[PDB]
Each structure stands twice: as structure tokens, then as C-alpha cells.
Design a protein around this ligand. Structure first.
Ligand SMILES: O=C(O)/C=C/c1ccc(NC(=O)C2(NC(=O)c3ccc4c(C5CCCCC5)c5n(c4c3)CC(=O)Nc3ccccc3-5)CCCC2)cc1
Length: 550
């Protein structure tokens, strides 16, 4: 069937990509899907189902589901918003209950969704190709979004790791992911790797793909109500349904993956993994290691020679294509792990304070920097700068520019202690900038505060990137950080820990850094469990057993 059908009603709103370029995107993501399954696909599917059988998932309470709702979550069309839900307002609660009862009783009626153009901020690039048409966001009403959590949050948290094991991308902290890739690359006698990119993955996702995904969730130990909810949600929401613009007008219909549902990450990860595992077999790739993050895929296998490797890669692509997962740019085999780019990241290595090698993830800074510039300019609700600080803590750019710029701003506005909302693997997080050292130590380790000996290639990328954006050079940043550090130190408590640890790089005479004792009390049990992009999940950072001297 067609991924989408349209009435012609415009996608209305509520550089930053806008609702103007929405029509250009619509044309790309709209097509009939052709899918042919085989025994390899069927086999891998049964192996996945067997691992799912071991999962037991629990039904979440209305209360449990509510607390998971982000405070700025899109308001319901039934007269309540995120605040009411979180507060367990009698109105919100009663509607949620009715929504639930309706999933338990109605098994066929399509549930309405809202289509919107995501206003993501990207850099002004006049050189290469074209100014990217805006990504689409499809989502049900807040009450449905709450019911999704009751029935499937435990499934989407537990099941992907049970099924995929170490191949599951979102189970890893940045350091863990790096360690996984390095060990896998080292594990091969003669390693070869590649990244496989799918052209509009969400659109290539068929209704059968969605039915197979439910067939996996149905292997869990579920409460009969959870079981029904999943059945009804698959039929009425996940396989497709009508599209409505922000102005209440009917836009058309969907028969592919909805980008803003709880099952988007999980479902996409499962689907991609299924197809890829099957395609590996079709291409006869030897000793495969996969790493899957939604639609993003990386394969590290044993090389069989440059000509053979290129051939098996075409084989893989042909199978993926038959399964309805064709590529954007066709895959290229790499024989350096640093050379594999996935989720825009790439492996780099630096040295610690004692000279030991340290692998870390990096990326080109152009987009994180431009988005940060947009954010300093206009008060955005959710802050990419803080997420990039967390994710790319060991990187040269995050330390020298992001940390320096934003810490001086919080000093100026006397707002170090004020919590901010940022993103980690699709989930929304409330984080106090004063907790950044503890968070960093727990996701990257002490070395993150004392990395040096950066590669000439990374230094140059950073240097160039600064030049093209009109950002002062790295020496200017060292001067500024020396001051930011001085001010943070003269404030004690967490502020001085930010000074000492985050800005140890800016001082010629480096301090010996010992572990932060309060870092152990940080509960990050919900942090690197799973991916929830479009999932509408919120976690406020909490601290189990606080000592007085802190
Ligand atoms: O010695 C040498 O050889 C050179 C020295 C030198 C060169 C330039 C300066 N710049 C400044 O002082 C000012 N800008 C900045 O001190 C500045 C800081 C961060 C900036 C950022 C981002 C960096 C990441 C965090 C968010 C802010 C951008 N731009 C920045 C400019 C340049 C800018 O204006 N906008 C953009 C646009 C896109 C991307 C980045 C930027 C402040 C007053 C006058 C302009 C200072 C010294």
C-alpha cells in the first residue's frame, strides 16, 4: 500500500526547518511499498520470538503512566494538558480511564493522529545539495499517549535487550557503546565494517512489519488488559489511520510507522535488526556483529577481501531492499573503525592524565554549535546544548566551547541551580547544570575531565568548524574558561566541582582529580535502558541516599 495518501490540506504549524518545505518532504515519503519475505527472514524472526518468550512485562498504573508524561507535552484536544495529567487531575484521569476502556472494547476503529512539521534547527549550508525539507511528526492524543505507557512502557524498556542482546544500541552509555565497538573490531582477525542507511525508514515500514512487531510483544507475559490494549493499539493506531493538521483539518491517511508513538524506537529497532540479521545471512557475511539504534545500523564482520566485501555488501543491500528497506546512499566497506560514521558519531581516541589510550565518540560540531547559537538567541523549551555536553563530554569542542560558553551565561544569569530539560536517546530529562560533573563521571568516567593528545584530524575539524561559523578560536576559549573556572571555584559546593572538573583543561598546572563521592548517589537506572524518540517520556534526575556533607 501507499505509505501516505493526502487530501491536499496543508500541514499547518502551532535556519529552523519550517512548515513551508513540508510539501517537498511529503512527495519523498509517499510511495507504494513492495515487500518479499523469505526463509532467512522467517528463521531470524522465530529466533527473536524465542528470546521475547523469556520477557514478563507489567501493566503500569494511571498514576505511574502520568508521572512519565513530559511537563510541556502537547495538550489533549479533550480539555487538559501535561500539567493536569502529571497532577492527576480528576478530569485528565477520568478521560485516560475512558480512553483505556475504549481500547479494551473497540478493536477496529482507527484512532486519530496529528501531523506536524518538526522545526529542527540546521546550519546555513549553500554549498552541498539542498536545504533539507522538514521532518514530519505524527502523534495520537495525550490520553492515548498515557494509555500507550500503561500497556507498553515495560515492554519497550525490557524486551529490546532481551531479543537483541548486545546488539541493542540504546542499552549503552556513550562509553559502553565505544567499548562494545572497539572490542568487536578487535575480536575480528581481519575486521571490516559498514553503516547501512535506509531511505525514509518510517515509510518503508509496512503494516505486516507492524503486525510482526506485535507478534514479538505477544511473546511477553502480559496481563489480559495489556494483551488487549496491545492488540487494539496495533490495529487502531500502529498499522495506520487518519492524519489531522494542527488546525483540526483532515490531511489524509498513514499506512506506515508513526514517528511520535511509544513503539517508534523499539519497533524500528526490532524491524531494522530483523531485516539486517536476515540480510547478513542472505549475503553470507562472516562473524557479524550488529549495533542497532532505531533505523541506524552498523555491521562489523570478518573481511573476505576488498572485492568479496564489496560483492557481499551488494548482496546485503538487495536482501534489505526485498524486505522493503532500500538504502539512501549505498553502503561502503571501511577497514578503520574511526572511519565508520553512525548516528553522526565516529570513534576517536585521546589520552588520559597518565598517558593511557581512551576511546570516545565524537562528531562534526557544525550542527551542535549552530543549534547552541540558536538556543542562546531564542529561549527554546528543550536545550540541545546540554544534551551534547552530556553525550560529547570527552570531546574537545564540548569542553572548550559548549561548557565554556554556557557556564559563563549561567554565572551571569545566576541560574546554575535552575533545572533544564534536555534529550537522552529520545527521552526528555530534567537536569541541573551543577550535577554535570557527577553525570559525566558516571557516563564517561574520570578520564573525561583529563583527556588530551587529541588527534590532529579532530583538532583541525574543530578549528575549521569554528572559522566557518565566526566563532572565536580555541585560544580565546581557554582565556574565557580560566575566568569561568575562577568564578565557579569561589562559590564552593557543586559550583566549585564544576570549576575544578569541567575546566581542569584550561589550567597549565593540572589538578589531580579524585572521584566525586556524591556521584554514586545518582540514580541513572532509567538513563541508558532504551530509546524513546517520539515516545513522549520524561525523567527528572533523582538522588538515592544523600549524605549531609554534600
Ligand atoms: O585573537 C584572535 O585571533 C581572535 C579573537 C576573537 C574573535 C572573535 C571574538 N568574538 C567575540 O568576542 C564575540 N562573539 C563571541 O564571543 C562568540 C561566542 C560564541 C559564538 C557562537 C556559538 C558557539 C557555540 C555555543 C553557542 C554560541 C557562535 N558565534 C559566537 C561568537 C558566532 C555568531 O555570532 N553566531 C554563531 C552562529 C552559528 C554557530 C555559532 C555561532 C562577542 C562580542 C563580539 C563577538 C573574540 C575574539
Amino acid at each position: 500500500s501507499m505509505s501516505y495518501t493526502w487530501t491536499g490540506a496543508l500541514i499547518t504549524p502551532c535556519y529552523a526547518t519550517t512548515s513551508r518545505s513540508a510539501s517537498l518532504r511529503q512527495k519523498k515519503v509517499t510511495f507504494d511499498r513492495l515487500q518479499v519475505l523469505d526463509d532467512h527472514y522467517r528463521d531470524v524472526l522465530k529466533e527473536m520470538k524465542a528470546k521475547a518468550s523469556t520477557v514478563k512485562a507489567k501493566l503500569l498504573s494511571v498514576e505511574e503512566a502520568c508521572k512519565l508524561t513530559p511537563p510541556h507535552s502537547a495538550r489533549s484536544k479533550f480539555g487538559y494538558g501535561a500539567k493536569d495529567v502529571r497532577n492527576l487531575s480528576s478530569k485528565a484521569v477520568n478521560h485516560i480511564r475512558s480512553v483505556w476502556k475504549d481500547l479494551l472494547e473497540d478493536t477496529e476503529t482507527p484512532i486519530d493522529t496529528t501531523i506536524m512539521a518538526k522545526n529542527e534547527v540546521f546550519c546555513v549550508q549553500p554549498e552541498k545539495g539542498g536545504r533539507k525539507p522538514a521532518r514530519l511528526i505524527v502523534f495520537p492524543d495525550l490520553g492515548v499517549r498515557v494509555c500507550e505507557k500503561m500497556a507498553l512502557y515495560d515492554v519497550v524498556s525490557t524486551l529490546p535487550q532481551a531479543v537483541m542482546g548486545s546488539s541493542y544500541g540504546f542499552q549503552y552509555s556513550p562509553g559502553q557503546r565505544v567499548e562494545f565497538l572497539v572490542n568487536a573490531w578487535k575480536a575480528k582477525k581481519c575486521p571490516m565494517g559498514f553503516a547501512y542507511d535506509t531511505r525514509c525508514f518510517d515509510s518503508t515500514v509496512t503494516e505486516n512489519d507492524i503486525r510482526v512487531e506485535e507478534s514479538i510483544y505477544q511473546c511477553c507475559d502480559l496481563a489480559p488488559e495489556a494483551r488487549q490494549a496491545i492488540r487494539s493499539l496495533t490495529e487502531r493506531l500502529y498499522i495506520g489511520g487518519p492524519l489531522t493538521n494542527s488546525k483540526g483539518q483532515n490531511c489524509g491517511y498513514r499506512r506506515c510507522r508513526a514517528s511520535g508513538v511509544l513503539t517508534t524506537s523499539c519497533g524500528n529497532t526490532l524491524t531494522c535488526y530483523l531485516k539486517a540479521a536476515a540480510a547478513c545471512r542472505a549475503a553470507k557475511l562472516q562473524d557479524c556483529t550488529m549495533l542497532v539504534c532505531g533505523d541506524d545500523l552498523v555491521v562489523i564482520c570478518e573481511s573476505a577481501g576488498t572485492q568479496e566485501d564489496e560483492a557481499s555488501l551488494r548482496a546485503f543491500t538487495e536482501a534489505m531492499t526485498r524486505y522493503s528497506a532500500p538504502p539512501g546512499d549505498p553502503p561502503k566497506p571501511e577497514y578503520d573503525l574511526e572511519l565508520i560514521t553512525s548516528c553522526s558519531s565516529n570513534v576517536s581516541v585521546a589520552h588520559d592524565a597518565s598517558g593511557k589510550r581512551v576511546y570516545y565518540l565524537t562528531r562534526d560540531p557544525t550542527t551542535p554549535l549552530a543549534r547552541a547559537a540558536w538556543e542562546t538567541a531564542r529561549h527554546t523549551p528543550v536545550n540541545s546544548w546540554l544534551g551534547n555536553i552530556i553525550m560529547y563530554a570527552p570531546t574537545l569542542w564540548a569542553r572548550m566551547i559548549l561548557m565554556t560558553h554556557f557556564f559563563s551565561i549561567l554565572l551571569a544569569q545566576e541560574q546554575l541551580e535552575k533545572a533544564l530539560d534536555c534529550q537522552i536517546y529520545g527521552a526528555c530529562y530534567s537536569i541541573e547544570p551543577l550535577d554535570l560533573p557527577q553525570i559525566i563521571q558516571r557516563l564517561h568516567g574520570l578520564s573525561a575531565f583529563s583527556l588530551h593528545s587529541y588527534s590532529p584530524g579532530e583538532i583541525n575539524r574543530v578549528a575549521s568548524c569554528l572559522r566557518k561559523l565566526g566563532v572565536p578560536p580555541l585560544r580565546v576559549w581557554r582565556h574565557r574558561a580560566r575566568s569561568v573556572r575562577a568564578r565557579l571555584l569561589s562559590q564552593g559546593g557543586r559550583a566549585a566541582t564544576c570549576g575544578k572538573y569541567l575546566f581542569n583543561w584550561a589550567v597549565r598546572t593540572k589538578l589531580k582529580l579524585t572521584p566525586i563521592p556524591a556521584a554514586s548517589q545518582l540514580d541513572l537506572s532509567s538513563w541508558f535502558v532504551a530509546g524513546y524518540s517520539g515516545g513522549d517520556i520524561y525523567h527528572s534526575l533523582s538522588r538515592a541516599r544523600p549524605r549531609w556533607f554534600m
